[PDB]
Amino acid sequence: PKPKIVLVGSGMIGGVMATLIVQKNLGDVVMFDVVKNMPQGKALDTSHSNVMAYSNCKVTGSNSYDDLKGADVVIVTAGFTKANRDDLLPLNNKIMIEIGGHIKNLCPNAFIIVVTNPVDVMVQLLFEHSGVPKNKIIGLGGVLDTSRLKYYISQKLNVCPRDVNALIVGAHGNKMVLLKRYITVGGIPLQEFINNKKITDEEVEGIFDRTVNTALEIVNLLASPYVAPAAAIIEMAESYLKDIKKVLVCSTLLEGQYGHSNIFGGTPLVIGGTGVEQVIELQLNAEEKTKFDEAVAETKRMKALI
Amino acid sequence: KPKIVLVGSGMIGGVMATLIVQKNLGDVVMFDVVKNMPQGKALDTSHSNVMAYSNCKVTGSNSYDDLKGADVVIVTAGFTKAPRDDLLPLNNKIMIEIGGHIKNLCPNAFIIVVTNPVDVMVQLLFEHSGVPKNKIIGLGGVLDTSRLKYYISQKLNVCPRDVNALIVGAHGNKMVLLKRYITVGGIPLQEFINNKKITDEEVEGIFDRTVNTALEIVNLLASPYVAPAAAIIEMAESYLKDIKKVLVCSTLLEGQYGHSNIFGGTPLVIGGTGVEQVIELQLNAEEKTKFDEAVAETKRMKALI
Amino acid sequence: PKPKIVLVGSGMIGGVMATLIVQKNLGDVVMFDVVKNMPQGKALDTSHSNVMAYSNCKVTGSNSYDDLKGADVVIVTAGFTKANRDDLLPLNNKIMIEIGGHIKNLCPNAFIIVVTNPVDVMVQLLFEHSGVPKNKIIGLGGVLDTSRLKYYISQKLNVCPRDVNALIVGAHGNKMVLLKRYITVGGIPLQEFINNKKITDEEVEGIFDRTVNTALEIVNLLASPYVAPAAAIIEMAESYLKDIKKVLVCSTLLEGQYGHSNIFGGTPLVIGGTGVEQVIELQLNAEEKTKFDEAVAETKRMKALI
Amino acid sequence: KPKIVLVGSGMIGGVMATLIVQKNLGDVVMFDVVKNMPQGKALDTSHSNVMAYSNCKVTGSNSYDDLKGADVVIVTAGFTKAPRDDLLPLNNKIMIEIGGHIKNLCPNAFIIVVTNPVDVMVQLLFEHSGVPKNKIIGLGGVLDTSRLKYYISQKLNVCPRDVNALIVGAHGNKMVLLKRYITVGGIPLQEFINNKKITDEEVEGIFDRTVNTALEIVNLLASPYVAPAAAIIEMAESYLKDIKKVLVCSTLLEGQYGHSNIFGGTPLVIGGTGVEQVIELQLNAEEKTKFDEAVAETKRMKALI
DNA sequence: TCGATTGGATTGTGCCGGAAGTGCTGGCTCGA
DNA sequence: TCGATTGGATTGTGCCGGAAGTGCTGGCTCGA
Ligand SMILES: [Mg+2]
Ligand SMILES: [Mg+2]
């Protein structure tokens, strides 16, 4: 009766996700990791927070892929991140193959969210080896990236962060396409605020660069991004589990949109109870489309290196 | 802990008190000139603290004395008419009375005016209460746009809150529905029109429905009060928690859109100090014409108090 | 995918329930009433509040019992309340028969919460005519009554209302059994607070009487109780829908507990995803058991008058 | 809007900052003596305002100067040891330093101390900060009882929060687990024992597990910080929103249980003025003996700073 | 013989204990 | 001919409009 959420990967992001799931009473949680005992420990700690949250989510740890059985949602964060980053692609491909095989056998009706980087490659690899329908698997990207852009704008303009809307498309990572044309504040075009000298074009460009550079900025400060990534993922999962039909930018299978096929890329989607209910194709101008093309080209380049 | 005084404990007051307890926003005084009724509603509501895990006192009052020390005052009191100018003098008197009490008892309160016609009444209460211009606003845009957003969202099959829209000028039949400023998930509505997911004609139809929603509800033998209460609490909460939401509300115009000495609906930023920013939209000529018509109607009615 | 909640009765309590369901994003709502148009109007108003709540619940009105089809939860508030109150029993019995027939045909797997008074009679009548399992139908009583007791105690002692716990059993209504022995404050027996002179036995008796008399107190003040009843009902429904397994005092079929069978009465229950998961029989002393007996006797007396 | 300063930005600090943003409770300063790290964590956390619909500033600091104007200060800084007395002098020094700064910069702040051994450290910080006795408490009972409540709830198949329990005296191996005060849905646990739904032996086993939970987690290669952070935020929130929850925390004893000049765990009421009530449990002789043992251990360690 | 999962406390990092103290390494088992 | 669903705005209350103004009733349709 309660949803089963399996976290494939119980690292930094996995931990925060389990915490938020208990806070929101969203479902039972399996914290899976190939590393022995650690996820069981994290699960034990997290389970006690049910009391403070007035929730009732079972939180367990697992080192067995057999616990994917009957999952309603599967969130994949596991994979190599440390020692050229391209060198990690064949390793993580192998991991995606393994996971895919289990999903196919044990929870083929699950909704799958992929986080492992580079996400636009990894999500397609898992799609190919899991056999799940295209409307049932997406990758994390736009919700996180746009949360950075929205937040920075909101702080310059002194408004509620959620009241800034913005779209970032194409791919997660350094080739992300920031669409200046599509930024609004309380529903009002950003350009009105630029005209009123509340923010300059220069400052906006600085905020674009900071958005692109945020992960590196956090790592250079001897931290790692996992709170905002976890919150973004849980926003996606919750939109599925509660059939909210939020418009969220995620990585999805392109079937001709933006002139590309047989590749995943970031685009606004509607996430509801049946999974991806709508794929929205933005009416990009030529320059924006060129940037999208470049993002997709980089995804393809890396896909060839598995 | 904040003190919220509801001047008027009718059906919208009831829902407001319910939501304040749900959100644990502050202690509540339910005031009404009707004897005993607000005490009864307050008693009922107070028990819901248990279910909500909250701790808000909820009391009823027939005395304006209980305005003392209010942090927020929400005025819904006043004569109503189902969807005329005859309400203007009567309700003027009420604004005078309430105003005096605010002036004497809670001059630092943040005031939200709901009494219709709201764009007139909020200015009257502003004048008679003596509060600063950044500390008093009128309900309009949050409610009207909640209707517009909802109807569009159901045509496009998306989350209602993911539609954004601005309705300005005045709260009433002359409300200015700004088609150019509608977005869905941050995307201009024009893109959905181009893709034939919705038409210009359907958008105009939804504009008409939005304008006439209170009438539509009354024709169905109901009274609009749930959404109005929720809109008011969204405003009050943005103040109490310093959220700095952009919310369209009626505020004193000081030259914006070419108008002064009058209140009108415009996007505002609501935070801990009250109205922190009044945002003037860069309207084109046609839009400005519509805004002018809305303000002209407010002025016309103001002449009849 | 989203739960379907059908409110059979769209009066004062129904209205607040629909409002709270949207606030909590708990499910789609059908506001049913035999009265034409009114529920459609209330539904239209309530639906707009989805925007303020960041929810996505469809709220519709209905004058057709056919809309019970596929209900996951059915909440019955409809029935005569106005012109001896016993005179209303045969009328409301007829209503329970009608409703029951539709549940049997259209949503036999629904979880049913009965509110129509006198609830301990009405809930059994609906049980008998709906054919639903005994673990799938309960009546409102204890959550509401104890919310009054908890609140009044909490105000005298100046603590959080939820930190007072108390049990009231037997029946909803004037024969409710208030169990002084079972009152705690922050987990601490009330008697410790009486010993410390924070509250007297006299004051406690006054609070007991006020608890019994609360509905009358509100009506005498020219109001009607519907906010707290609605919140209590939604707490019950949510415990079912989200499998929380809260301990909640409700009216349920007695099968020998407290020495009674073939009758419904108020007792602590556990409400989870399968409905009533546990019926907890309190270890009452002789005096308490006599009071329970008297409550059940009144329920039987009224049941004979349909 | 409240200012919350986290003195210590380790793993428990991270979860605290995350929860404060989720609950929109106030602006957050993540302080640490470790350079750059809290700035990075704060930057990460700040973005989650968007997902949470909140507006809490989250900044990082390596300067005690940013204590200025804090409404709440949560101290987790200090040397740790996995589940000895050698921590006592070292952490004493830290309490002195932090204390001085509080005294100078936020003397009206509400202080929550977590640094172990907490019942000693909270008293040291009390002494060196000069804050009133009702404005400083130590973490213990909310966390320990969250474990006890959870384990019992899973044996009886009920909602974890519906188990109530008191653990008093001290936060550590001498914690006093009061079997007589356990309830389930308000019902004495003894009734469930009588019905054989759970046994006396299983309750003693769960007591043992509760005492040793941090060790159990560490043996599983993890570190307890999620539940501790959640407990701390429940305390802080009861202060910030004036909820008046009954929460077991370490507080200055002034004759309660026969002890003075020492802090110990007891049920408290936490509201807008701080500790509004210190509730002395009416313990029997055996329970009192256990309480005495807990306090005697705190005293023993206090002698070694 | 020789390395140790896609994770991590304070430190590093196959695990486990002792030492030092804003802080890692020596001595061990398991199984390829 | 004669009453009007288990609900309700401001008032009452089958519905619908006008009047008066912290506030109801006159004139109508539908269908038993
Ligand atoms: Mg490793
Ligand atoms: Mg009727």
Author numbering:
A (entry chain B), C (entry chain B): 3 to 85, 94 to 316
B (entry chain A), D (entry chain A): 4 to 86, 95 to 316
Paper text:
Previously, we identified DNA aptamers for the specific recognition of Plasmodium lactate dehydrogenase (pLDH) for the diagnosis of malaria disease in human blood samples via impedance measurements and colorimetry. In this study, we determined high-resolution structures of the pL1:PvLDH complex and apo-PvLDH by X-ray crystallography in order to understand novel ssDNA structural elements, ssDNA folding and interface features for specific pLDH recognition. pL1 folds into a hairpin-bulge contact by adopting three novel structural elements defined as a T-loop-like motif, base–phosphate (BPh) zipper and DNA G·G metal ion zipper.
The pL1:PvLDH complex was crystallised under two different conditions. One aptamer was bound to dimeric PvLDH in an asymmetric unit of P41212. Therefore, all descriptions provided below are based on the pL1:PvLDH complex structure belonging to P41212. Electron density of pL1 was clearly observed. pL1 folds into a unique hairpin-bulge contact in complex with PvLDH. Therefore, a total of five intermolecular H-bonds and one salt bridge are observed at the interface between pL1 and dimeric PvLDH. Moreover, the magnesium ion interacts with the ammonium group of Lys84(B) through one salt bridge. Fourteen bridging waters form water-mediated H-bonds between pL1 and PvLDH.
